[PDB]
Design a protein around this ligand. Structure first.
Ligand code: HEM
Ligand code: HEM
Ligand code: HEM
Ligand code: HEM
Lengths: 142, 145, 142, 145
């Protein structure tokens, strides 16, 4: 469970990154595909997996929108992400081992641009948030 | 492991830019704060509170030791398993460190290095760094072969 | 989240095992210590780690009573297991990676004694249960 | 790995008691039911509901193949890594199976074996069985060394 402290810390990061959000989504997704190429099997439609390819760009926007939604729904992530959980379980069948990988890539992408926001105690708040997001997305698997 | 030229250059390049004392100290403190159960493996290191962990001289020292341990692999990239043979024994048979923790520590180091290097830590660069850490973590875990 | 079907399955198993519960906890603990010796560090005060020693017998009873509490709190494991979580986090300081190990050894132990209860669908419920218990025990770590 | 006389005889003794078709089919179905995300790796084995998985002949066939695959390690106890070299390439470079999944399947196998062997599957027996599965999963995962 996220404390009030964690929630404030997460929402404030999210406000801070707003301007650069679509860039962040595109680059993090680029990182996941190149750094953890096991994830490529889910996106074999896209010929160009470079960040700045139109499809990586467009889907990066979508992931960040999903995360903005999670932020809006931070008090009950399970309820707030039920549709997306269902989608990742049954329409796609994403291996939930992969959720942690995306999370790490978002954190890394953010650290390259906003390094001052990455004090250990804030990173602790962000990691709890992404861990709860992953758990919420995993809810509908079984 | 077959390293590409880009990969070898990038790994040496990264470590040549890291102050082992600063980065190691920061990485270990980060792990003990973000994943606080990891503290149990250091129960003989004194006062551990985030500010206490940040100020602990034993943690600063052991963080430096980890970076020097990684340097051994940077200086021996084609022979990491053999180089880490005694370290692997130590962290399993002696210290009984659950292997997930090697990934936790590796991810902290990656975030520490990404914050330092900034724009320079591209997807391509992180890809090479992570291949390196995967080989290192595979060599540090209990060896069945 | 456990379904009402999962909760029924777990309650039904828990009823079936009552006469053998203390022996189930003792054996499961014995299996944990021998099969996954990294766990011995938490109990290095026991001279005899065999499932018939008095320390292991008495502690298997304690585990099983913790799990009986979890059955009674099955509607909200997180709230029901809060003190046990804080204990495992701060007094005993247990790497929460070990919870899944003990869960597994309990399931193995149960399988050897009650093999007819291990239909795929029952096993699925029991695993969801043990995973939820472990997630609840993990709550107060950070 | 170094096998004791006890471990060696216990592993061969366990497998001498298994109907590879019955155990393999029950094991793969168990994994696909208890951990349904693992179904993704098998998206061309037809229909995968619990009754459908249970009656699925290709699932039965493939579970059998896995057990014979394990039998191969039983017959090559001191050379498991080389024995599994091609299978490791298959399961990583070609199939991209997350290694967590090997552990999930191993755990399902152990519970199926436990249910069959009953009281004979003692802690000391399980220990030897788990060592073997650890060596196997290590040889099946991506090879860095
Ligand atoms: C932080 C975790 C994640 C979030 C918030 C997230 C969010 C989203 C959203 C909002 C969509 C679009 C749904 C729609 O259009 O209705 C989506 C689609 C998708 N997601 Fe995720 N996702 C996450 C993790 C993952 C991971 C880890 C993978 C695989 C490695 C994955 C694979 C996919 C695929 C294949 C699609 C369909 C994309 C397409 O059709 O091009 N997702 N996700
Ligand atoms: C990249 C991963 C790691 C590397 C390269 C590494 C390297 C080292 C080295 C070089 C030593 C000193 C051994 C000696 O005295 O010769 C050491 C000791 C130790 N390591 Fe690690 N280590 C790693 C991960 C971990 C993790 C994740 C933990 C705990 C969860 C851990 C716990 C310990 C402990 C408790 C000692 C003993 C320290 C002492 O009392 O001097 N290590 N490690
Ligand atoms: C199913 C999950 C678990 C449950 C339900 C559980 C339950 C309990 C309970 C109820 C106690 C109180 C002991 C007493 O009052 O005498 C306890 C203590 C303890 N637990 Fe757990 N536990 C679990 C998992 C674990 C694991 C995985 C470990 C370590 C590998 C662990 C290590 C300990 C230790 C060291 C104590 C103190 C034992 C002593 O006082 O001698 N526990 N546990
Ligand atoms: C104990 C661990 C395992 C062993 C010993 C094993 C063994 C085998 C063997 C012998 C084959 C046939 C290879 C060939 O056709 O040349 C195979 C294929 C395959 N395995 Fe595994 N396997 C294991 C675990 C897994 C796991 C966990 C998964 C996925 C969750 C998996 C997915 C597959 C798939 C998708 C194929 C190809 C199926 C086909 O095309 O017919 N395996 N495995």
């Amino acid at each position: 469970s996220l404390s009030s402290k964690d929630k404030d810390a997460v929402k404030a990061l999210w406000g801070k990154i707003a301007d650069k959000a679509e860039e962040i989504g595109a680059d993090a997704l680029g990182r996941m595909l190149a750094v953890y190429p096991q994830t490529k099997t889910y996106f074999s439609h896209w010929k160009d997996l470079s960040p700045g390819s139109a499809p990586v760009n467009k889907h990066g926007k979508t992931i960040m929108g999903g995360l903005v939604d999670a932020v809006a729904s931070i008090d009950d992530l399970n309820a707030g992400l039920l549709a997306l959980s269902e989608l990742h379980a049954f329409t796609l069948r994403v291996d939930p081992a992969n959720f942690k990988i995306l999370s790490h890539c978002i954190l890394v992408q953010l650290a390259v641009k906003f390094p001052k926001d990455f004090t250990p105690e804030v990173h602790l708040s962000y990691d709890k948030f992404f861990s709860a997001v992953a758990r919420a997305l995993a809810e509908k698997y079984r | 492991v077959v390293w590409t030229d880009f990969e070898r250059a990038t790994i040496a390049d990264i470590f040549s830019k890291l102050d082992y004392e600063a980065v190691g100290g920061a990485t270990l403190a980060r792990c003990l704060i973000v994943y606080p159960w990891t503290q149990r493996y250091f129960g003989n290191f004194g006062n551990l509170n985030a500010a206490a962990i940040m100020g602990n001289p034993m943690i600063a020292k052991h963080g430096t030791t980890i970076l020097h341990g990684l340097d051994r692999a940077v200086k021996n990239m084609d022979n990491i398993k053999a180089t880490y043979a005694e370290l692997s024994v130590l962290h399993s048979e002696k210290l009984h460190v659950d292997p997930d923790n090697f990934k936790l520590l590796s991810d902290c180091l990656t975030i520490v290095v990404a914050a330092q290097l900034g724009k320079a830590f591209s997807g391509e660069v992180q890809a090479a760094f992570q291949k390196f850490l995967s080989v290192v973590v595979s060599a540090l875990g209990k060896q069945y072969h």
